[PDB]
Design a protein around this ligand. Structure first.
Ligand SMILES: [Zn+2]
Lengths: 123, 72
């Protein structure tokens, strides 16, 4: 709670691939949403595709799934892990995602209060 | 024996190169400005991949890639 929601994404997505609970990319995300097995959806607003946001919003509106935004594309690679890390700690080859959907969480406490209570506020 | 090098065949076989289709997710869902969606692809009634896997709209049959089920 001491950190805002912009840092909860760097710990809820960093502790979910360990337990393999994502549908990274658009087609995996669409499969997860149509499978009724989606809990969190993450979008980057930097996608210039017109039909991308429309269908993602429509699927996230027909189903009762929380919608999130990050406003940046490439950096999401570090939130998910599509980067080549160096020995010094330098991620060089970065490929960023546009629609990442969570299906399960891990075992941590720092992110269990920051963004997980940002849902009912919208009700 | 002794090596005789006969490499002659009916030219050379070409390995099937797949076609790079961009954003194939688009054509499965039709989204209007009102929010409601329409499913343009008919779906397979199975258990291994039901609820999310669409079939093939060919000229005479519907076909699921994963199930290999064909409806004529
Ligand atoms: Zn099938």
């Amino acid at each position: 709670g001491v950190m805002d929601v912009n840092t909860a994404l760097q710990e809820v997505l960093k502790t979910a691939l360990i337990h393999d609970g994502l549908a990274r990319g658009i087609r995996e995300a669409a499969k997860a949403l149509d499978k009724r097995q989606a809990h969190l959806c993450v979008l980057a607003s930097n996608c210039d595709e017109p039909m991308y946001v429309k269908l993602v919003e429509a699927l996230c509106a027909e189903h009762q799934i929380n919608l999130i935004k990050v406003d940046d594309n490439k950096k999401l690679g570090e939130w998910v892990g599509l980067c080549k890390i160096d020995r010094e700690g330098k991620p060089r080859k970065v490929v960023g995602c546009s629609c990442v959907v969570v299906k399960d969480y891990g075992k941590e406490s720092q992110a269990k209060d920051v963004i997980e209570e940002y849902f009912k506020c919208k009700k | 024996k002794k090596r005789k090098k006969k490499s002659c065949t009916t030219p050379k076989k070409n390995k099937h190169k797949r076609k790079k289709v961009k954003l194939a997710v688009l054509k499965y869902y039709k989204v209007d400005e009102n929010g409601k969606i329409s499913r343009l692809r008919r779906e397979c009634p199975s258990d291994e991949c039901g609820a999310g896997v669409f079939m093939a709209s060919h000229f005479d049959r519907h076909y699921c890639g994963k199930c290999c089920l064909t409806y004529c």
